[PDB]
Symmetry: C2
Subunit: 264 residues, 2 copies
Amino acid sequence: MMPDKKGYIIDIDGVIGKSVTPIPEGVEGVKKLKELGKKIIFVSNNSTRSRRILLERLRSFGLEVGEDEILVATYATARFIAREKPNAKVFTTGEEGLIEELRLAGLEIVDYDEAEYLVVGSNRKINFELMTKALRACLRGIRYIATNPDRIFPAEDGPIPGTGMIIGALYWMTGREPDVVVGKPSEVIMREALDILGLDAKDVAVVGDQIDVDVAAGKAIGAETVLVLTGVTTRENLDQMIERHGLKPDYVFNSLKDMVEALE
Amino acid sequence: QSMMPDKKGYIIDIDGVIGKSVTPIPEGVEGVKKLKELGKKIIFVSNNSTRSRRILLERLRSFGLEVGEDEILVATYATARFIAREKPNAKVFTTGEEGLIEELRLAGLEIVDYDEAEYLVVGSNRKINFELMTKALRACLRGIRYIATNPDRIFPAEDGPIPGTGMIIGALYWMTGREPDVVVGKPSEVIMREALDILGLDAKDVAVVGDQIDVDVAAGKAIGAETVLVLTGVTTRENLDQMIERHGLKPDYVFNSLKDMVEAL
Ligand SMILES: [Cl-]
Ligand SMILES: [Cl-]
Ligand SMILES: [Cl-]
Ligand SMILES: [Cl-]
Ligand SMILES: [Cl-]
Ligand SMILES: [Cl-]
Ligand SMILES: [Cl-]
Ligand SMILES: [Cl-]
Ligand SMILES: [Mg+2]
Ligand SMILES: [Mg+2]
């Protein structure tokens, strides 16, 4: 059996690029998928970059990509809120790229005492007072959205905290988890992706480099899952990752290029 | 019971009882003076993870109290000595502030980076940042022995709730699945049994006095000591029933202030 579908939900980091640098076989793979006429949407959990920046990044990899072909957690979070409550007042722990999207969606950036929504995103400049403000917003009982649940972001010099750090802190202090988690493996971003694709899950494959994020995301919407080995998961650690995370992908390929070549 | 039975010793919380931050509570200060005149053994037990024993001694003396080193057991000191006893000169990595670092050094411990540490020591830090949390994460992931100064999730500061040391505990648990191996501060038995061992008294002869049901009353219950709640701090006459209900525990005695407890003997 081959992973031959009408549409593809494709993770960026570890599949198509690593930070600002392209993964050559990932790029080749996406180009050939596009040439075959498949519908593609890139889905990213990035909580600090705007849709604009990631579109520019993909184009710098040599890809032809339109606005509708990228769904990033910053944008998806802002949108989600704007649909619920146009011009909502939001207090955020997050960074400029998230703030950019919140503003583009018509939302008003305010302090915790004025907020209608608490929006948790990662912040490299997080500090004790921002955490105090988030704590108090939490205790006010206002609607609480998180951009993505990632506990640990796998970086080259080692693990660093993800948005999950703030989520964890707030849960421990108040007993409150987010009302809504947007990013993978949440169904929120995934179902929005299906919507944008205009396809049901049976006609979609979800492609990524993390079993706990991408494969779990596919499982959550009942789409077939493809794990590539160009990112976090390797030939060396594959069996251990399957064990650690408790899920097996439907397919494993060295890179996206190999997945596409399996369609011929 | 409106009257207080005569205990040989007292474990007394500071914040909300004797002072609020650097400001004395006159009825608390007077209560301590009177207990000392009665010849009762006293130890102040504080969950403060940012201040050294040196600084809290100075603070109590600034309230006009005559207090010795052995009469204060603060979580910074208690944590450092707990570790040093287990492993003299242990290498430690900490998230804490200068006050904790001071006590760790005074106990003979070596402050090192996360990759060399034998213990992870979690204390609150008002200058907490992403780099420090990265370091803590990595120390935590190594599986090394992990001690927390105190478990307080929320610290009841004068101008509204602020995060406690439990913020960092919470973050690390969520990211790694690990809770501290040992929690030192109240309501943990660790600091409380050390207090009993400084007093040279069994719990049956000691009352534990504080302003928080979830910390001070819980602490006394954990060692089987009678509990006294004063109303000079977090708990008030107005919110008392709400606090019993929220925290799920009843103190043995309630007095408006430490002075009133002492007068009821
Ligand atoms: Cl980035
Ligand atoms: Cl990304
Ligand atoms: Cl392209
Ligand atoms: Cl993240
Ligand atoms: Cl203080
Ligand atoms: Cl204190
Ligand atoms: Cl200090
Ligand atoms: Cl604290
Ligand atoms: Mg990835
Ligand atoms: Mg207190």
